[PDB]
């Protein structure tokens with residue numbers, strides 16, 4: 192009899208409870224949301240599935256072997272005190288990845304094609320042909336070449352965009368020019384549409400700012416460069432996005448993530464011209480997908496196979 | 509000395525004149541818009557580039573060897589009296605094709621992802637997460653598997669959609685289920701998003717009607733099926749689109765082409781929920797591309813090589 196899995200996910204409690212009924216069927220779960228677990232013995236607990244966990248969890252469960260992230264980032268856990276020196280496994284999923292690419296490609300196309308202008312004219316019953324360059328005349332610069340960035344690059348290339356990439360260590364992608372950390376300025380100067388798919392770390396906090404927007408390509412086929420972010424909202428300075436759009440440094444933006452969520456009702460971003468807002472719904476983590484992932488990684492671990500998608504603890508993602 | 513090419517293109521006269529200055533440099537052109545050509549001898553004329561040509565053109569130029577269509581359809585010439593029994597060459601172009609696929613993919617994604625709802629909420633400063641199935645759960649049925657349809661199919665598949673096709677004769681496309689003329693009802697019943705890329709012929713006039721919309725899949729992942737048309741506007745019955753959307757037979761539409769263009773200011777389509785209108789700017793024919801195409805086909809013909817993209821005169825496209 193294997194011990195039950197500890198689950199402390201601070202989102203959608205009724206959904207977590209329901210979906211747990213059919214999860215971990217060989218061992219069960221300990222849902223930290225249940226008041227009946229306030230005094231529970233976690234000394235045998237091997238695996239913990241955590242999203243914004245209680246600060247004292249590691250004192251209560253000192254013999255954990257693996258922590259599984261309960262969402263698609265680890266910024267919710269990576270900085271907390273007393274985080275044990277054991278593997279932390281990211282949540283990744285094929286359906287999530289392909290849905291991020293749908294969003295990224297759609298946003299890039301809407302900027303390329305002038306969706307804002309088309310919509311504005313449509314609402315006013317105005318027939319107004321727009322000029323748009325073909326995708327090959329426009330360079331999309333993808334920042335982050337991980338699971339999401341690699342998929343987005345491939346699909347943007349199929350749609351015809353010129354695509355370049357930037358990541359901390361240069362990533363080899365056949366047929367795509369790729370740049371490493373220190374080449375940021377060179378990469379920005381080549382980029383017409385910036386696509387942000389970075390994790391949140393100290394290095395990427397407040398990273399998309401005024402100075403960065405002013406380094407994007409100014410003489411490209413869209414006229415003015417565009418900023419897209421679906422990584423983490425705390426990576427951008429929203430007041431600088433607003434200023435950049437107003438001043439013509441940016442021609443537009445698409446944002447799925449915000450410094451504070453939900454985005455404040457009074458944010459200037461809602462009504463800014465050529466800006467598309469989605470309410471952090473580009474590619475959400477879902478409970479069944481999460482539990483299948485964790486179950487699979489436990490099955491691997493219990494065969495003595497390596498855990499997959501283990502974060503780089505020193506790098507923080 | 510080869511005879512000049514006859515040009516009678518009833519659109520953008522000043523643009524045609526300007527672009528002709530650098531076209532056909534080994535022989536020149538006869539622009540039928542120039543009043544100085546009212547009495548011109550066309551007895552030596554070999555090639556004619558025509559878009560909505562004068563009705564008496566073939567009487568004036570009785571020795572033509574090839575007619576080149578001056579736009580990306582031939583419905584503007586195919587039905588006219590006295591059209592000679594000589595090859596009629598379509599205008600086709602790689603940049604046009606890839607731009608149609610940008611539009612098609614963008615429209616399919618905007619329906620998949622709920623762009624209408626996202627935009628509506630954004631305008632009202634409302635944070636409102638939407639649910640959308642991944643593309644693989646949705647079947648796009650592409651009607652027309654020619655130059656445009658084949659490109660759209662390939663790119664929709666890369667984005668993850670399930671894709672099926674319909675054409676007059678079944679077209680073999682590796683990995684895509686394809687249907688022939690008589691299998692229309694079966695094809696419609698499998699289709700969640702209909703993508704129309706048909707030419708205008710008698711058989712396709714008034715083809716997208718109430719009866720057709722009621723045959724689309726009703727129990728699919730989008731809830732209600734969607735109608736997209738970027739072929740020819742006279743292929744659809746707009747009042748039936750309006751009724752179908754109002755009644756919930758269609759969940760939405762995207763239209764680049766209309767029965768009458770420009771679309772009447774009072775059309776109900778402009779303000780219909782979940783309907784996207786573009787003003788026949790999905791993939792326009794452009795003058796330099798047209799002239800390069802015609803010049804190339806003349807070069808082939810004068811080597812004794814076959815003309816490409818010759819229409820099927822009996823089929824009418």
Ligand SMILES: NC(=O)c1ccc[n+]([C@@H]2O[C@H](COP(=O)([O-])OP(=O)(O)OC[C@H]3O[C@@H](n4cnc5c(N)ncnc54)[C@H](OP(=O)(O)O)[C@@H]3O)[C@@H](O)[C@H]2O)c1
Nearest residue numbers: 263264335336337338339340358359360390394421422474
């Ligand atoms: N909006 C949504 O719904 C949504 C959904 C899922 C995920 N996300 C976010 O998207 C992020 C990315 O996901 P992923 O799976 O693609 O991540 P991943 O596989 O961990 O890849 C991260 C990429 O970012 C790069 N990177 C990290 N720090 C960097 C730095 N300081 N400078 C330059 N590049 C840096 C990495 O460089 P190396 O290749 O050199 O390591 C790597 O290429 C997640 O962490 C999450 O925050 C958002």
Ligand SMILES: NC(=O)c1ccc[n+]([C@@H]2O[C@H](COP(=O)([O-])OP(=O)(O)OC[C@H]3O[C@@H](n4cnc5c(N)ncnc54)[C@H](OP(=O)(O)O)[C@@H]3O)[C@@H](O)[C@H]2O)c1
Nearest residue numbers: 580581652653654655656657675676677707711738739791
């Ligand atoms: N919105 C725009 O900006 C824009 C731009 C360019 C073109 N267009 C329009 O798009 C059309 C399609 O272009 P294309 O280059 O892809 O054409 P294409 O290469 O001629 O292919 C036409 C396709 O339609 C099919 N078809 C024709 N009549 C049919 C019928 N009665 N039943 C079933 N299928 C039928 C053909 O079947 P088979 O394969 O059996 O022959 C073929 O697959 C053009 O004719 C033009 O009207 C629009």
Ligand SMILES: [Cl-]
Nearest residue numbers: 429430433459
């Ligand atoms: Cl602000």
Ligand SMILES: [Cl-]
Nearest residue numbers: 746747750776
């Ligand atoms: Cl009507």
Ligand code: NA
Nearest residue numbers: 430431433434
């Ligand atoms: Na500001």
Ligand code: NA
Nearest residue numbers: 747748750751
């Ligand atoms: Na009607």
